Amino acid sequence: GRMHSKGKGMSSSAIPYSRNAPAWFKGSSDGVVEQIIKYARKGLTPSQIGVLLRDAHGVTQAKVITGNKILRILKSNGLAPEIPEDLYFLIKKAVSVRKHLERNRKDKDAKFRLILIESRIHRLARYYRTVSVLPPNWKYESATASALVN
Amino acid sequence: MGKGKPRGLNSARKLRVHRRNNRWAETTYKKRLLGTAFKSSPFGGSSHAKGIVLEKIGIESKQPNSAIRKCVRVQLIKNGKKVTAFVPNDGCLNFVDENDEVLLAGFGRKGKAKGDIPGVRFKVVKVSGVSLLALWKEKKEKPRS
Amino acid sequence: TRTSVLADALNAINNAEKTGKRQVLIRPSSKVIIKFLQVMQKHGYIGEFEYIDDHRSGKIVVQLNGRLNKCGVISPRFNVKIADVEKWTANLLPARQFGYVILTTSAGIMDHEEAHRKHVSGKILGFVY
RNA sequence: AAUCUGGUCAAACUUGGUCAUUUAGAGGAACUAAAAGUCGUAACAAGGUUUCCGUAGGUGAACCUGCGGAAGGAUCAUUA
RNA sequence: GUAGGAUAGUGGCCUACCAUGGUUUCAACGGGUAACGGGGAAUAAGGGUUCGAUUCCGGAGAGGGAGCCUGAGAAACGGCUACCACAUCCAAGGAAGGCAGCAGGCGCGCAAAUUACCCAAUCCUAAUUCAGGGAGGUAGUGACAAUAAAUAACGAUACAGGGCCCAUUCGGGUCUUGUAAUUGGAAUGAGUACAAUGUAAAUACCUUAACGAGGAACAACUGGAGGGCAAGUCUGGUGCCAGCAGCCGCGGUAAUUCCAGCUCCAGUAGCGUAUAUUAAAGUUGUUGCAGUUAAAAAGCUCGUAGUUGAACUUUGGGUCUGGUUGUCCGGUCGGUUUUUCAACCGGAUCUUUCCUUCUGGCUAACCUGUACUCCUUGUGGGUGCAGGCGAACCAGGACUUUUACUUUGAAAAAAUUAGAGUGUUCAAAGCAGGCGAAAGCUCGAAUAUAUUAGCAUGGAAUAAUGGAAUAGGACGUUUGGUUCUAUUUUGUUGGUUUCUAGGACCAUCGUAAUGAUUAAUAGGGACGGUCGGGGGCAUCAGUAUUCAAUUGUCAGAGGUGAAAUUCUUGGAUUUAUUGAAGACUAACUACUGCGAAAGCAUUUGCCAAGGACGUUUUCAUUAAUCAAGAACGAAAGUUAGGGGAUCGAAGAUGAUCAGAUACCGUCGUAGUCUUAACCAUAAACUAUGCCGACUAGGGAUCGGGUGGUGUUUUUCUUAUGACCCACUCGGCACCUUACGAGAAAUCAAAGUCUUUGGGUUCUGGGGGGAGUAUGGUCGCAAGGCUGAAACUUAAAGGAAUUGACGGAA
C-alpha cells in the first residue's frame, strides 16, 4: 500500500481481456518496432515511447501487437540505457534534493525526503544487482551519483 | 492480527530467544538462575540451619491481632549471619533458654514473613538436640541442662 | 503483502458462512485452493465452484451449502510425521469420528484419512469441522 | 655407576601487576516495618487556585509557579 | 603455505622462511554455573518443565601443579623424582609420607552405617584345576525408597433395633440384626524354642514339635475437629493474654480456631513439618496469554540482518490387471473356497505423452514361420532355428539442477520405559520354568519405542532453487576444420604419418511451433491535470501592545474576587498624528485540510518534494515488517547572539486566616519570541504497532473523476466556472442489533479466538522497593538511553452497582 507514504491508493491502469490484437487497430508490428527505435534514438524513455504510441497512433500495447514489450525490443536493437529509466529518474531526484539541501542548510523535511529517495535508489540498485543488469560492487549514492547522472 | 510472535516455519531461534528473555520476568526462575538463595537468604539455600541463641526477644505483632510473639535472635553457625526465629506453642521460649544451640527451619512462605510476626522468617525446631513440639507435649523429656 | 492466498480465501469463506451467504467470491484462486475446494466437495461441505479466467491470476466463486462450520488453515505448513497426524487431528477436529485435516503430500492434496489409507503424509494446509 | 656440557619440559619461589569472588570497615545517605508522636492539608467533591505530564526555578513540608502539552475535565452543545 | 624436525603415525604438534589470514549479531570472544557428558529420573491428556554426585557406558583425578622410569599399554600415584601446601618418626646427624579403595576417626555440617564374616557364588590376575581378591558376596546398623498385610473371629445366653402370623389392648418374637468387665467353646503368629532346613560357616527366611490372649492386654500412632477442607455452635480453664493460624483469620468475660477430657474426623505402620521442584500455571503461552482503559504499542518515520511473501507450467478420460475385507451359501469336519457382488489400495498401459540414455553382455519370450502337424471333423497342443520384439537381469560409461519435506528400511549397547509369557502362596519382582517311564523328553528367554544428525529407498504435492533473450542455446545425414589421445596389429624397441575410434574447441548446413508465463485492485518509476494552514528561503498586512517625540485638555487614572494596596498631575491617563524595535500572525476557523510524527493558518514569490487521482504507459518480485544502526523531534533548559510589549518560575509585596514566603492582588530578572548550537524527553495519547484480507445498514463531509437536452451565468449557440442529482474511488467522522467482542465502559473494530495457526516488529508477567543502586554509554550541563537485587507486603489495580457525599447543575 505504497512503499514510503501512508497513502494506500489504487490509482491504476486497468488492462483489457484480449491478449490478442484489438482487430481493426491496424499498422504493422515491424513498423511499430521501428518507431520505438527512432524514439529511443531521439531520447524518449521506454515508458514515454509507449505513451506516445498510445496517444496519437493506434497502438494499445507493444506486448499485444509485436509480442515483445518495449525495453526488450530496445535491448535487442541496442538502445536501452546503461542505467534503467526509473532508477535514473530516482538518482536525478536524489541529486536535486542534495542540491536543494546544499543551497538551504536548514531544511528538515527536505532532508528526510532526500534520505527516503536515497533509500529507494539503494533498494532498486540492489534489485538490479540481484537480477544482473547493473554490475556488482557498485553503490549509486551521492558524490559519484551526480557524475553517474551526467 | 498475526499476534506478535513470528509464525514462520524457520522462525524458531528467534522464538527461543524471546522466550529466554521473557524468562527473566518470572521471579522464581530468576532466583533459580542467579543463586539468590546461595548468595543471600541467611540459610545456604537449605531446609534447615543450626544457630546459637544470642537472646530471647519478644516482638510486637503486626496489626489486627495485637501481642508479643516470643522470638529469638539467632546467629547461624555456618555463615555467621544473624536472624530472628519465632518460637511456637505455649511457653517454648523458656524451654529454649539462652546461648543454646537451636536448629531452625523456614517458616513456610519460601522466605518472607509469616502472617503477623513482622521481620521474622524461622521456626525454632530443635533446642540443643530435642524438638520443641515434643518438649511442649512432654512425650519426650529434655536431656537436663 | 498478500501472504497465504489460500488462507485468505478460507477466511473469506468462513466469514461468508458466518453471515449466512449462499456463495462466496474469491480473488486470487490458486492450485492449492482449487484442490482444497475439490476435497471439500468430495467430503460434502460445498456446492458448485467455478474458476473465472481473469486473463491474469484467477477469480473463484464457491457455492456454500450451509454445511461448513469452520474451514480452517494452519499457519506455517508444518512437517507431519504420520504419528503426529493423530495429535494434529485431536488438536483441531471435534470428535474422533468426523471432520478432516487437509494436508498436502507427495501423492497430492488430500484429507488425513485419505493420507492414512495411502500410507503417505506430508505438510498440513487446513481443516473442515 | 657417580660425575658432568648444552637443551627441554617445567613445578615452585621472589617481587611486582591484574581480574574475579569474598570480607572487616569509622562515617555517610537511604529504604522498609510498626497502632495510638509534631507541623502543615498536597490529592480525592470545580477537595475549596480543576487534575496530570514534560520541563526549568524556588521553597519547610507537602508543594508552589513559568512554559508547552494533555483530559483520566469541571464541556462529546450556540446555532445564522 | 613450503620445507624440515619430531611422533607409532595425521597434523602449527614444533622449527625455519613467506603470505595475511581466521572467527563473528546464523552471537565470535568474554563472564557465570551451588555444570563432569549421556543412558536415564520426577512429574505426566497433547506440548512440556525441572533433575541427572550416584549400580551401565564414556571422560577426567588420586593434597596441588610439574617431570619421568619400567613396560605391549601409565605421563600410573595402594611406582618413582622434585617444588609448594600439609603433616609424621627421631639419639638432631637424618628417615619416611598421600583413604576421592574398604572399615573407622576427626573435621565440617540440616545431612549419611560395622575398624564384622568369607571366597561357596559372581567374575577377575598369574608360572596358573590348586593361590589370591575390602572387586564381589555374607550378615551387622538401616522407617532412603518399594511390595505384601496381624492388631481378634464364631458362638451361645442377657438388653435393644428390623421383617411381622394377627395389629378385640397386649403379645409370642415363630424369622433376622446390633449391644453387655457376660461366658464358651474353635484357631492365630507376633513372640519363644528342640529339631530339620538354609549357609563357605552362620544368621534370617520358608518347615515344624512344645509354650504361648481376653481387656490389666500378645495395648496404633500421627495429625486435625469455623472456613478453604473430612469432622464439635460440647464442657471448663483463658479473656488482645498465652497462644493457633500456609491463607482467611480467631483472642478484648457467652472463644465451636488457644489450653485439657469425651466424643469425632482423616490417613494408617505410617503421618506430620521444612526447603526445593513438577502439576495445578493458558501466572512464560509452539500447541496456548495479554498490551483503548487492569502490567504492556518504541513520540514518529527510515532501515541491514532476520522472519515472511500474489497467481502460472501434466490436467483430465479409457483399457486391462494384482490384491482386501464385508457379502452369497457354509461348497464344509467352531473353522475353510468360489461365485452374484462391493468399496478400498495398487500395477501396467493408451491417450499430441517417456520412466535417464547408450556401449555391450542372455535377447526370457514368441511379433515370428523354418518341416507343419503328435492329432475329437479344430488354430486345443510343441520337437524347432537364419532376420529379430530386450526390461528377465547385469557391468560399464555418460552426466546428473540442487535442496528442504515426507516413505519404508538399515543402524539409535544393556538396565530403565512400554510390553508378551509364566502361580515369587499374592504382589513389588524374577527369567524363569514345564512334562515323563516320572529310566528321559521339553517350551522359553519375545515384540515396541527412542523421532535431533548421518546412511538407504520410494514419493514428486507443498516451499525454495535452477535453465535458451549479445542464444557463445539445443540436437545431427552436418560439411570443413582446429587441438588432440592412442591401443591395436606392421618381429621388438625409438620414431613419423596413417586408417581409425574416443576427448575437447571455433565454422557453416540443416532440424524444430526454435527460446521471455502472468503483468498480482503487489511494488517502484515516467506521464497527465490537480490539491493542500505540508517544509525551506523572501516579503506584506492587521497591527497590537510599549517607550519616546510633537498634540491637546487640570484630578485623579491603574488594579480588585468579593475588597483593598499600588501611580500622577510640574494633565500621568485620556485625545490625536507618527517613529523605533523585535514579537505574533485573530476575524477567517468547521466533528474543515495537509504533513513520517513533532507540527503546520496574512502576502506574494521563489525552491524542491508529496499523497490522492487518472493511465489500453513502463520495469518484472524490486515486496511486508524489522534487533545494528539512522532521520526528525513540542515545550522548557542549556551555551552563544538579538530583543524584550504584555503576561511572567524567580523575587518583591497587599490583604486573608490560629498561621499562608499560597491562591487573589499589585509589580516583574529568566525567558517567553526570535537567530546559531544542543538536548532527545511528554497524558509526543486515538492512553488503540504495522501490512493484509474479509464480514451491516446510512448519510453527509474534504480530494479526484464519470454521466446527466438538469439549472444559472449571457457576450447571441456558448465554452470555462458554480452548483443540483447518481455513481465512483479517497482521509482527519452517527443508529440498531449483535449472531462477532468484550470484565464492562463500549467496539463495525477493540470482530472473523478453547470452532484456538494471514504476515511481522516491539512490549508486559502481584504490588512496592525503583526508573532507584551499580556499572556501561550518551551529553556543556540539567538529564537521557540502559537497568538490579536485598528487603518488604496481601492486596495494587481495573471496570462498573448501590449508596453517602460535593463551597457541581
Ligand SMILES: [Mg+2]
Ligand atoms: Mg491497496
Ligand SMILES: [Mg+2]
Ligand atoms: Mg516500510
Ligand SMILES: [Mg+2]
Ligand atoms: Mg485489632
Ligand SMILES: [Mg+2]
Ligand atoms: Mg637443566
Ligand SMILES: [Mg+2]
Ligand atoms: Mg475553583
Ligand SMILES: [Mg+2]
Ligand atoms: Mg487540598
Ligand SMILES: [Mg+2]
Ligand atoms: Mg486542587
Ligand SMILES: [Mg+2]
Ligand atoms: Mg516558592
Ligand SMILES: [Mg+2]
Ligand atoms: Mg609435515
Ligand SMILES: [Mg+2]
Ligand atoms: Mg547437569
Ligand SMILES: [Mg+2]
Ligand atoms: Mg563442578
Ligand SMILES: [Mg+2]
Ligand atoms: Mg552422571
Ligand SMILES: [Mg+2]
Ligand atoms: Mg558437587
Ligand SMILES: [Mg+2]
Ligand atoms: Mg563411571
Ligand SMILES: [Mg+2]
Ligand atoms: Mg583428601
Ligand SMILES: [Mg+2]
Ligand atoms: Mg601423578
